[PDB]
């Protein structure tokens, strides 16, 4: 039995893909990168901004990637949370878990400040026994640093922890952390793709968690 459910954010608790595609596109196109499709961008969602830019442009220079990251953040300040929506099952699910007395948290590559700002005008404050974002860690998912950090801060036993995500990055993160995984196909990752990694279940919607 799990007493702690930890969630990925993008594509798992919230559909942020419209805001994410808008911000990536503005930056890519200001630098001359054309014919990059929405799907090409969406498939990188949940990688670090630097990883995403590298995949899409082929640039590896640390300075240039940092510069894209900064330019992206600036767009995101404007468009991100305005173009992020809740999933149909987000609020009822998390309400149901909290009534069970399960502890909930978020481990995400998106900046925590960005998540909190989203949460402020969507979820009841303050849901969420712990939130670890991209700025809280040096190494990012699939590195287990953030996940292990959260488990540590909660004084949890990994045996009682379920990690829930939409991507193979998330699946890799749970495995690396030695915690149970439940995949949700609400992102761009299919049930066939999750087969490469350990899981309990693979569900279509978060509501199926209940």
TrEMBL record:
Transmembrane segments: none annotated. Pathway: Organic acid metabolism; glycolate biosynthesis; glycolate from 2-phosphoglycolate: step 1/1. GO terms for biological process: DNA repair. It holds the Pfam family HAD_2. It comes from the Bacteria. It catalyses: 2-phosphoglycolate + H2O = glycolate + phosphate. Its EC number is 3.1.3.18. This is phosphoglycolate phosphatase. It comes from Bacteroides fragilis (strain ATCC 25285 / DSM 2151 / CCUG 4856 / JCM 11019 / LMG 10263 / NCTC 9343 / Onslow / VPI 2553 / EN-2). The lineage of its organism: Bacteria, Pseudomonadati, Bacteroidota, Bacteroidia, Bacteroidales.
């Amino acid at each position: 039995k799990y007493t702690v459910y930890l969630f990925d954010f993008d594509y798992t608790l919230a559909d942020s893909s419209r805001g994410i595609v808008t911000c990536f596109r503005s930056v890519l196109e200001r630098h001359g990168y054309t014919g990059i499709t929405d799907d090409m961008i969406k498939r990188t969602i949940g990688k670090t901004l630097e990883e995403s830019f590298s995949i899409l442009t082929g640039i590896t220079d640390a300075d240039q990637l940092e510069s894209f990251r900064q330019e992206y953040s600036k767009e995101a300040d404007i468009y991100m949370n305005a173009n992020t929506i809740l999933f149909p099952d987000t609020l009822p699910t998390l309400t149901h878990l909290k009534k069970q007395g399960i502890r909930i948290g978020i481990i995400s590559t998106k900046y925590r400040f960005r998540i909190l700002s989203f949460l402020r005008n969507h979820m009841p404050d303050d849901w969420f026994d712990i939130i670890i974002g991209g700025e809280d860690v040096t190494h990012h998912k699939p590195d287990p640093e953030g996940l292990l950090l959260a488990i540590d801060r909660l004084k949890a036993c990994p045996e009682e922890v379920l990690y829930i995500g939409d991507s193979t990055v998330d699946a890799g993160t749970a495995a690396a952390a030695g915690v149970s995984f439940t995949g949700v196909t609400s992102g761009m990752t299919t049930a066939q793709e999750f087969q490469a990694y350990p899981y309990d279940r693979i569900i279509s919607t978060l509501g199926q968690l209940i």
